[PDB]
């Protein structure tokens, strides 16, 4: 839920790929979640 959560982590590769890797459940998603929409 979009309540501003620090559990989610954003990483970039220097080719300009900002994919979200969350650090409590560890997600590799190139998609922008509803809480990061």
From Swiss-Prot:
Residue ranges constituting the WW domain according to the UniProt record: 2-35
Q: In which tissues is it expressed?
A: Detected in brain neurons.
Q: Which residues form the signal peptide?
A: none
Q: Quote the subcellular location field of this record.
A: Nucleus
What triggers or suppresses the expression of this protein? Up-regulated in brain tissue from patients with Huntington disease.
Summarize the subunit comment.
Binds formin. Interacts (via the second WW domain) with TREX1 (via proline-rich region). Binds RNA polymerase II, HD and SF1.
Functionally, this protein is described as follows: Transcription factor that binds RNA polymerase II and inhibits the elongation of transcripts from target promoters. Regulates transcription elongation in a TATA box-dependent manner. Necessary for TAT-dependent activation of the human immunodeficiency virus type 1 (HIV-1) promoter.
| Record text about domains | The FF domains bind the phosphorylated C-terminus of the largest subunit of RNA polymerase II, probably mediate interaction with HTATSF1 and preferentially bind peptides with the consensus sequence [DE](2-5)-[FWY]-[DE](2-5). The WW domains bind Pro-rich domains.
Its recorded name reads Transcription elongation regulator 1
Native organism is Homo sapiens (Human)
Encoded by which gene?
TCERG1
